[PDB]
Design a protein around this ligand. Structure first.
Ligand SMILES: [Mg+2]
Ligand SMILES: [Mg+2]
Ligand SMILES: [Mg+2]
Ligand SMILES: [Mg+2]
Ligand SMILES: [Mg+2]
Ligand SMILES: [Mg+2]
Ligand SMILES: [Mg+2]
Ligand SMILES: [Mg+2]
Ligand SMILES: [Mg+2]
Ligand SMILES: [Mg+2]
Length: 182
RNA sequence: AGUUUAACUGGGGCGGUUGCCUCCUAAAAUGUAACGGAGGCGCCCAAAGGUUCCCUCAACCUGGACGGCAAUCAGGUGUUGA
């Protein structure tokens, strides 16, 4: 009875546009976004685990889902890290949660991006993938700026079903992220 | 005053060893020496035990920023090279 505007968009207009613009043999060659990944590894828990709790608090308030933290999958003396210390916080999505969060992000954080300049095609990998790292956490609405103690990191990435980068870029710009003009 | 004050030893003495475990020497059953070649043990564990269940890496291209050659990542060749 309730469902996200991007879900509808995908069903009716994005799918039709991509089909027309690439002449797929079948309807569903249309790649579809698979997983929005939201993790973080500070690397500072090796000296103090207090900041990890705050980062997870930010992740929970941003998502409402309870992020996990992983240990030192290997151990490195140079990084002063031993296996078993928690360094990486994760929080994942799927489906309606994926696209509600994506709509909120596109509507709020992107126009809210200080000195926003658009994102380039070239950080793809040719297989329809898209991932990079957030300047600052404070960009988000539900988070409180008066309570942020130290500027820490967040990431909410997107992925595709695209076989190559061509379809990935086509559908992604159809969704309408701010690609550069070069 | 009665006694003790090791053996191995390529002469003795000084060095080193003295039991146990792994490999090679070992001639494709076992076994098989040398002061031959090389390494460890005199523990750890209420779970690192039992069982049931889930699942499997690392190699890999990219980076909304720190964050770098490497921190967490997901897309999608991935057969122990972890
Ligand atoms: Mg894809
Ligand atoms: Mg006598
Ligand atoms: Mg003798
Ligand atoms: Mg002699
Ligand atoms: Mg001698
Ligand atoms: Mg034999
Ligand atoms: Mg003999
Ligand atoms: Mg020894
Ligand atoms: Mg058990
Ligand atoms: Mg992935």
């Amino acid at each position: 009875k309730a469902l996200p505007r991007l879900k509808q968009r995908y069903r009716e207009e994005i799918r039709e546009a991509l089909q027309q613009e690439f002449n797929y043999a079948n309807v569903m060659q249309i790649p579809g976004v698979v997983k929005v990944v939201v993790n973080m590894g500070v690397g500072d828990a090796a000296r103090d685990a207090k900041l990890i709790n705050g980062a997870i608090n930010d992740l929970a308030l941003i998502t409402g889902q309870k992020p996990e933290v992983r240990r030192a999958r290997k151990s490195i003396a140079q990084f002063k890290l031993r296996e078993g210390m928690p360094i990486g916080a994760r929080v994942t999505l799927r489906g309606d949660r994926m696209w509600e969060f994506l709509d909120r992000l596109i509507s709020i954080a992107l126009p809210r991006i200080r000195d926003f300049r658009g994102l380039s095609p070239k950080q793809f990998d040719g297989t329809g993938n898209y991932t990079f790292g957030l300047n600052e956490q404070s960009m988000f609405h539900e988070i409180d700026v008066d309570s942020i103690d130290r500027p820490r990191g967040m990431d909410i990435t997107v992925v595709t079903t695209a076989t190559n980068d061509a379809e990935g870029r086509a559908l992604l710009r159809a969704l309408g992220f701010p690609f550069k003009e070069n």
